[PDB]
Amino acid sequence: TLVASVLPDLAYAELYSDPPGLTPLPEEAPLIARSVAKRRNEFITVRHCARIALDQLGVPPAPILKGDKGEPCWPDGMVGSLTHCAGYRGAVVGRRDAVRSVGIDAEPHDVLPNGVLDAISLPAERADMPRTMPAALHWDRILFCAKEATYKAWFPLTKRWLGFEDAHITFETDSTGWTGRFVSRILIDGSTLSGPPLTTLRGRWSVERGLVLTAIVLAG
Ligand SMILES: CCCNC(=N)NC(=O)Nc1c(CC)cccc1CC
Ligand SMILES: [Mg+2]
Ligand SMILES: [Mg+2]
């Protein structure tokens, strides 16, 4: 799997297409009652992945509903994160006693559209990241992925907004050249609903088969 390369009580499951025959759980059905087919398929497939991963942690097949800010609603005692892009659906779930929060993201390994980089980055990230990332790799897309994984690990614990300028992310590369680590340092107040505040979120990145994958797993 691609997501295992960015992971260190924890389970995952991913699919690269939308298999026929999959249906949503009846509780989930109204959330895509009048949605386009592309949205319906990615919604159904990634939640099947979620249930495959939750089954590994002993959780019966349950519906994954959405909160007021779109965040996924996990069964009791479980955390996780979902992501879907062109050609990828991914789910990583964890046991809340040992895993405090999870955030993942997948994007096609392409250059960002013009003007997007300025909106998702801090000036020091645009300056230092070309020097720590391998040549030809779309470091701008990877940075955006790490921003997205950061937000998905941040929000379930804080329930507050986190802008692209509210976290400074530094990157490192493994000797293998296409994987590495990153550190997301929150610049605003990281007070959580429970537990110690969020200050530093460490994660992993990987480019493989035309996809960028990032993931953050916070230990409980
Ligand atoms: C440092 C972290 C900053 N990163 C973000 N704040 N990331 C987003 O808000 N991502 C987003 C999502 C959530 C995946 C859903 C819909 C639209 C967007 C972008 C407008
Ligand atoms: Mg998506
Ligand atoms: Mg995404």
Swiss-Prot record:
GO MF, one annotated term: holo-[acyl-carrier-protein] synthase activity
Gene: pptT
PANTHER family assigned to the protein according to its UniProt record, in alphabetical order: ENTEROBACTIN SYNTHASE COMPONENT D (PTHR38096:SF1)
Activation/inhibition comment: Inhibited by the amidino-urea compound 1-[(2,6-diethylphenyl)-3-N-ethylcarbamimodoyl]urea (compound 8918). It acts by binding to the phosphopantetheine pocket in the active site. Inhibition by compound 8918 kills M.tuberculosis.
Name by which UniProt lists this protein: 4'-phosphopantetheinyl transferase PptT
Similarity field: Belongs to the P-Pant transferase superfamily.
InterPro entries: 4-PPantetheinyl_Trfase_dom, 4-PPantetheinyl_Trfase_dom_sf, 4PPT_N, Enbac_synth_compD-like
Pfam families recorded: 4PPT_N (PF17837), ACPS (PF01648)
Something else known: Identified as a drug target.
Reactions performed catalytically: apo-[ACP] + CoA = holo-[ACP] + adenosine 3',5'-bisphosphate + H(+)
Known role: Transfers the 4'-phosphopantetheine moiety from coenzyme A to a Ser of acyl-carrier-protein. Involved in post-translational modification of various type-I polyketide synthases required for the formation of both mycolic acids and lipid virulence factors. Acts on Pks13, Mas, PpsA, PpsB, PpsC and PpsD. Also acts on AcpM, the meromycolate extension acyl carrier protein. In addition, is involved in the activation of the acyl carrier protein MbtL and the nonribosomal peptides synthases MbtB and MbtE, which are involved in the biosynthesis of the siderophore mycobactin. Required for the replication and survival of Mycobacterium during the acute and chronic phases of infection in mice.
EC number: 2.7.8.7
Any GO BP annotation: siderophore biosynthetic process
Superkingdom of the source species: Bacteria
Cofactors: Mg(2+)
Keywords of this entry: Magnesium, Metal-binding, Transferase
Source organism phylogeny: Bacteria, Bacillati, Actinomycetota, Actinomycetes, Mycobacteriales
Binding positions (Mg(2+)): 105-107
Effect of residue 161 to L/S: Confers high-level resistance to compound 8918
Any one cellular-component term (Gene Ontology): plasma membrane
Residues that bind CoA: 39, 47, 66-69, 83-84, 105, 148, 152, 162
